[PDB]
Every structure is written in structure tokens, then in C-alpha cells.
Curated annotation (Swiss-Prot), chain A:
<keyword id="KW-0677">Repeat</keyword>
<feature type="domain" description="CBS 1">
    <location>
        <begin position="20"/>
        <end position="76"/>
    </location>
</feature>
<keyword id="KW-0678">Repressor</keyword>
<keyword id="KW-0805">Transcription regulation</keyword>
<comment type="function">
    <text>Transcription repressor that binds to the promoter of gapB and pckA genes, preventing their expression. Acts as a regulator for catabolite repression of gluconeogenic genes.</text>
</comment>
<feature type="domain" description="CBS 2">
    <location>
        <begin position="85"/>
        <end position="146"/>
    </location>
</feature>
<keyword id="KW-0238">DNA-binding</keyword>
<protein>
    <recommendedName>
        <fullName>Transcriptional repressor CcpN</fullName>
    </recommendedName>
</protein>
<keyword id="KW-0804">Transcription</keyword>
<dbReference type="GO" id="GO:0045013">
    <property type="term" value="P:carbon catabolite repression of transcription"/>
</dbReference>
<dbReference type="GO" id="GO:0003677">
    <property type="term" value="F:DNA binding"/>
</dbReference>
Length: 146, 145
């Protein structure tokens, strides 16, 4: 590329998820909404990925979903999370080899803080990481130095 | 390459703000949760009778309050809000890299942008980890200087 900003853009475009992921926080689908909330504060995350008895991705839960559940008219804190989780038709994943910038674009478009990183297996998607707006914020800071 | 890095640190908040959402300090916790879903934002800025900033309330704090046992239809937000020793503000003239660092340490999604007036801190913007993420995307597309 011809200018220093173009060289910066080219490098940013090559960054891969495998290098900029966080550890994932995963709960089983039959854990209660209350237990999910406790896990969120225990682990200090704002998103949880939900898996089945084979540890395959079945759902995602955001802090907003849990607040909604907790404050509403129905008693939902006692129910299994699979009642309230976002399901697979509506879940976006990414893989280790994908580009960080393409994931950032998804975060912004889908108005969500985190995506799961998965590995394809014969049983479905195994969760191996998380990439978040916080990860992106860290990349931005690092640019200013080196 | 230092010089490029020196340019990045010169980018300012005014160019990468969002819309702030404000609530009065006497609103119930239930009413503030309602505002948070209506507005679809994750951080509320609390003001006093004089429209002066007195606190902040994140979605986390509201979840903390809701999975508790107080009559939150009763409880005014001043009871649980983070108060004005422990709040980090910024101004439109501040540098985005500075703010980004504060968002990271403090582990919060948003800071209030305020103006310094005759009356005190008046709220004029919000800056978030989404804003920072949008900057990173713009840089990757060569859409800034």
C-alpha cells in the first residue's frame, strides 16, 4: 500500500481471530436463569454460550436477555436457560482462521458484544473461544503504540 | 512508525460519540430498566434536579438490583447508582486513545461526555466500546485522517 494509513489498513485486514480471542464461558442448557446470572457475575462476562450434553453449541445468552427474564411479569428465574436462550437459526459463529475485522463488522451490525469461536466437528460446533468489542478496543489501543 | 502512532493519539472524542440517555435521580430502578429497554442502550446517565450529572447506571448494576429482593418499583436510582466521586467523565476535546484505555481498565462499556458550564457537568454525549470498534473498522478500510 502507498501511504502509512494504507499500510496500517492492510495489516489490520490480515489479523486472525486465533490471535485475539478470549476464553469462552459456557453453561449447560438446563442450568436455571438464576444460575446463569450468578455465572455471569462470577466469571465477569456479559455473554454466555450455551451447550448441550455433548458440549455442542445450542444457544447464546446476553446480559440483556437475563435482565429481561429477571424483571418481567412471568417468573422466569427458575426456568432452564434453553427456554430463553437465542437458538441456532439466529446465532452467528466464527472460526480461528477468520479475519478479526470481518468479526468486528458483525459485532457492530448485529449490535452484540461477543461472538463464539467454534471448531467444526461431526457433532456440531464446539466452543473454543470468544471474541468481543473489548478485544477490538484492545487492538485499537495497541496501534497507538507500536 | 512512531509518527503514525502519534497521529492516532490525536483523534478526538467529538468525532466518535453516541447519543447519551439521561434519567432523573428520583426515578425508580424499575423505571430506569424500562428506559434502558425503550432506548436500547446499556448505560444510563443520572442527573439531578438541575440537569447536572450525579451518577451512572450500567446494565450490570440493574441486573444486580433486579436479582435481589428490594421493591424496585420503590427504590429510587440514587440508592444504587455509581456516584460522583467514582465516575470517569470525558470532554469532546479529549483523545480517543485515552478514553479507550479508561474503558478497558474500568471494564465498562461507556463513559459520559460532558461540558463544563456555569451549572456543572452537563451531559452531551456517550462514548463506548462500540464507538472504539467502529474506529478500528474505519482504520481497516483506510476511511480516516
Amino acid at each position: 500500500g502507498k501511504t502509512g494509513t494504507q499500510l496500517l489498513a492492510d495489516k489490520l485486514k490480515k489479523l486472525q481471530v486465533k490471535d485475539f480471542q478470549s476464553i469462552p464461558v459456557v453453561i449447560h442448557e438446563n442450568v436455571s436463569v438464576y444460575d446463569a446470572i450468578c455465572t455471569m457475575f462470577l466469571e465477569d462476562v456479559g455473554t454466555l454460550f450455551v451447550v448441550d450434553r455433548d458440549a455442542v453449541l445450542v444457544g447464546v445468552l446476553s446480559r440483556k436477555d437475563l435482565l429481561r427474564a429477571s424483571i418481567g411479569q412471568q417468573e422466569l428465574t427458575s426456568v432452564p436457560v434453553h427456554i430463553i436462550m437465542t437458538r441456532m437459526p439466529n446465532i452467528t459463529v466464527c472460526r480461528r482462521e477468520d479475519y478479526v475485522m470481518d468479526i468486528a463488522k458483525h459485532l457492530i451490525e448485529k449490535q452484540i458484544d461477543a461472538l463464539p469461536v467454534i471448531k467444526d466437528t461431526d457433532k456440531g460446533f464446539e466452543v473454543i473461544g470468544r471474541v468481543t468489542k473489548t478485544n477490538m478496543t484492545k487492538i485499537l489501543v495497541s496501534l497507538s503504540e507500536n
